[PDB]
């Protein structure tokens, strides 16, 4: 209403990654804008790239079903999900071996949904029993435990300053959690239905959240409320994943119509319209530089848009 | 460069390995076992072993495949079936000791109502329709004993049938297709799995050969 409209922006495909047969659930992009890891369904830890367009590692796993893949900021450790509560941690740089395991993470009752690497030592997992606790490879046990959601959580989101993370369960609400003390600091509500994925602002002042109610909103940490709402009349489906831009100016949200929609910051206008997906999109990844955005659907098509 | 040139050969080798793994996994039928609470979850896997999900393997007449037991998992069905999209055969192990127990303190009804609700939610699903659900009847001896000691029509006032062993074992099949809406692309198989003999596995293993062809014909499109 006051901000100058950016206008209609055209999005084109930069590259298409082919050579995988399993379903692509998670697409975690590294902090170096060079490599990215994706998840499979037959226990194949696959790592892709944008410019070179060549996979670098693939190792069979004990757990066939993989829900997520976490890529370390330094590119040293990697961990996959799983429904059998087996969060096997793997490393790339190994002597006399390609990929090996040293520590085994166990002790969860609910199914693991997503995993995020806070740093090279402490990692956080999202289980299906409302235990989004933090773990360590050295001690093999959890340090702090986060609880307070009436339902199980299925998504996580870290912060650039590496000090706290926001977590939102299926209770149509999101809560912030500190790594030091380990308890909810603020609760945000206003979604009509459950959420699927959450994303954090690069600056750290707010965070966006997409739900199945065909609505989007960004909760402010200082104002303790959302600024604007992204309603939709001709959309009956929901949002499976949400992400920000390099600095948080552009909004990205994948819908169930085998495409994605690019929303503005305050104008709430569909500037970019996506297409070309044969199956339902699962998760998309935005690089730190904000140049290209890779999307992951169920048709084993890792298309990069730029 | 030399590294960029060797990367092509490395990609070719890793793609050949991935294709070999996919071809090896494409000949293994994926069975998905589920059931009610303690509805014979361990007595069924302890049969073919001599001749938090669970992974089991057993080869019969030169046909190796993997089988996934759901195990103990207390979660919703909206986010749990997304991982299990595309399973060819879902084996439901219904319980025969849930209609006699009293109503639970947390559940609004008894365990049999929860069992039929879970069956309805796993059958009348919009995600997977081309797949198939088989039903395994376990613990038949104790069921016949408790149905000869206590009647069965006292809890089911919908019908006025007799209290025998064959009629009770035959009426429980037709009561499962009334809840299904799509029948032209969905089918339900029911077999008898005795707990006293081990030679019954081959009585249902060939039954798998009946359903797999179905999804094979799903690639034909002539149906």
């Amino acid at each position: 209403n006051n901000i100058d409209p950016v206008g209609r922006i055209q999005m084109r495909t930069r590259r298409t990654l082919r050579g995988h047969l399993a379903k692509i659930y998670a697409m975690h992009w590294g902090t170096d804008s060079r490599l990215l890891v994706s998840a499979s369904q037959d226990g194949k830890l696959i790592i892709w790239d944008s410019y070179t367009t060549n996979k670098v590692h693939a190792i069979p796993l004990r757990s066939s079903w993989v829900m997520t893949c976490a890529y370390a900021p330094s590119g040293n450790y990697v961990a996959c999900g799983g429904l059998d509560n087996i969060c096997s941690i793997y490393n790339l740089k190994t002597r006399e071996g390609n990929v090996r395991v040293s520590r085994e993470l166990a002790g969860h009752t609910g199914y693991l949904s997503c995993c995020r690497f806070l740093d090279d030592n402490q990692i956080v997992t999202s289980s299906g029993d409302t235990t989004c606790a933090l773990w360590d490879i050295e001690t093999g046990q959890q340090t702090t435990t986060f609880t307070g959601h009436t339902g199980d959580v299925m998504s996580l989101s870290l912060a650039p300053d590496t000090r706290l993370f926001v977590s939102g369960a299926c209770d149509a609400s999101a809560k912030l959690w500190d790594v030091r003390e380990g308890m909810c600091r603020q609760t945000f509500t206003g979604h009509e239905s459950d959420i699927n994925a959450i994303c954090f602002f690069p600056n750290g002042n707010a965070f966006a959240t997409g739900s199945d109610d065909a609505t989007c909103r960004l909760f402010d940490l200082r104002a303790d409320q959302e600024l604007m709402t992204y309603s939709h009349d001709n959309i009956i489906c929901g949002i499976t994943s949400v992400s920000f831009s390099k600095s948080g100016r552009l909004l990205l949200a994948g819908y169930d119509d085998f495409n994605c929609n690019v929303w503005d910051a305050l104008k709430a206008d569909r500037a970019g319209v996506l297409a070309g997906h044969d199956n339902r999109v699962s998760c998309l990844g935005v690089t730190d530089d904000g140049m290209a955005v890779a999307t992951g659907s169920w048709d084993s098509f890792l298309k990069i848009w730029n | 460069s030399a590294e960029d040139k060797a990367a092509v050969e490395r990609s070719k080798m890793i793609d050949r390995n991935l294709r070999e793994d996919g071809e090896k996994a494409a000949k293994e039928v994926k069975l998905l076992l589920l059931g009610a609470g303690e509805s014979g979850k361990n007595t069924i896997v302890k049969q073919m072993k001599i001749i938090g999900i669970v992974e089991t393997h057993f080869t019969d007449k030169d046909l190796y495949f993997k089988m996934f037991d759901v195990g103990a998992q207390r979660s919703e069905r909206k986010k749990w079936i997304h991982c299990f999209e595309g399973v060819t055969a879902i084996i439901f192990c219904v319980a025969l000791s849930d209609y006699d127990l009293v109503l639970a303190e947390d559940e609004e009804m008894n365990r049999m109502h929860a069992s039929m609700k879970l069956f309805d939610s796993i059958c009348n699903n919009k995600w997977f329709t081309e797949t198939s659900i088989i039903l395994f009847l376990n613990k038949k001896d104790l069921f016949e004993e408790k149905i000869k000691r206590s009647p069965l029509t006292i809890c089911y006032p919908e019908y006025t049938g007799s209290n025998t062993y064959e009629e009770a074992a035959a009426y429980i099949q037709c009561q499962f297709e009334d809840l299904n809406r799509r029948k032209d692309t969905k089918e339900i198989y029911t077999h008898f799995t005795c707990s006293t003999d081990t030679k019954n596995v081959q009585f249902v293993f060939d039954a798998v050969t009946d359903v797999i062809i179905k999804n094979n014909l799903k690639e034909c499109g002539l149906y």
Partner: single-chain antibody, 232 residues
């Protein structure tokens, strides 16, 4: 984790000799293997290298057509057949394990090799210095020249730095001249233009008298050259 080499003894010019290398503890079908050799007179020279899984094979311009290599994945035993060898190729062979991927650090663990004494198009890289007595801890800066134009799409230097340490094999410590490998601390720095390279060495520790070796990573016949040596 180990690479033992056997097959030493005496050989006559014009005969045959068996050179084998037993290596275990890693995926033999997921690593590269080089056949670089070191002579007591000249520096390093590349003779052969085959891709993983018995893929592509290449040779030099003076060896292709005389020697033949082999490979064995199950038994993990190497082979090397000599056919009409001369007396001017005497050296001490090696058995190097390598790996090639994006951001990789190859040439980690090499072999020790046995002494093989014998009785009686191509690009060439130039060096800068041969031997200069420099005291330890004087901010030594080794320079390197080139006669080729580097205009690759990635934008990095295709060159590795080797150090012949008396006692073991010259393992690789500085790769791409801009990153640090495993086993060495972060204390070096590489700069320069696309033709000249300036590598600085700060705060040298004790017993650093080994000779350096420069190479290129854009062509199969790895041109090593003489190399730069230091003194006490």
């Amino acid at each position: 984790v180990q690479l033992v080499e056997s097959g030493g003894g005496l050989v006559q010019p014009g005969g045959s000799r068996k050179l084998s290398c037993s290596a275990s503890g890693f995926a033999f079908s997921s690593f590269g293997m080089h056949w670089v050799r070191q002579a007591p007179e000249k520096g390093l020279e590349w003779v052969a290298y085959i891709s993983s899984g018995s893929g592509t094979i290449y040779y030099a311009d003076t060896v292709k057509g005389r020697f033949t290599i082999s490979r064995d994945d199950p038994k993990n035993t190497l082979f090397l057949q000599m056919t009409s060898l001369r007396s001017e190729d005497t050296a001490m062979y090696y058995c190097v394990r390598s790996i090639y991927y994006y951001g990789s650090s190859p040439f980690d663990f090499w072999g020790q090799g046995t002494t093989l004494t014998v009785s009686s198009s191509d690009i060439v890289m130039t060096q800068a210095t041969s031997s200069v007595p420099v005291t330890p801890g004087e901010s030594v800066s080794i320079s390197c020249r080139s006669s080729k134009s580097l205009l690759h799409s990635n934008g990095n230097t295709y060159l590795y730095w080797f150090l012949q340490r008396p006692g073991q094999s010259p393992q690789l410590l500085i790769y791409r001249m801009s990153n640090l490998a495993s086993g060495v601390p972060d204390r070096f720095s590489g700069s320069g233009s696309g033709t000249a390279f300036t590598l600085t060495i700060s705060r040298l520790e004790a017993e650093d008298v080994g000779v350096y070796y420069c190479m290129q990573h854009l062509e199969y016949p790895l041109t090593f050259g003489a190399g730069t040596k230091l003194e006490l």
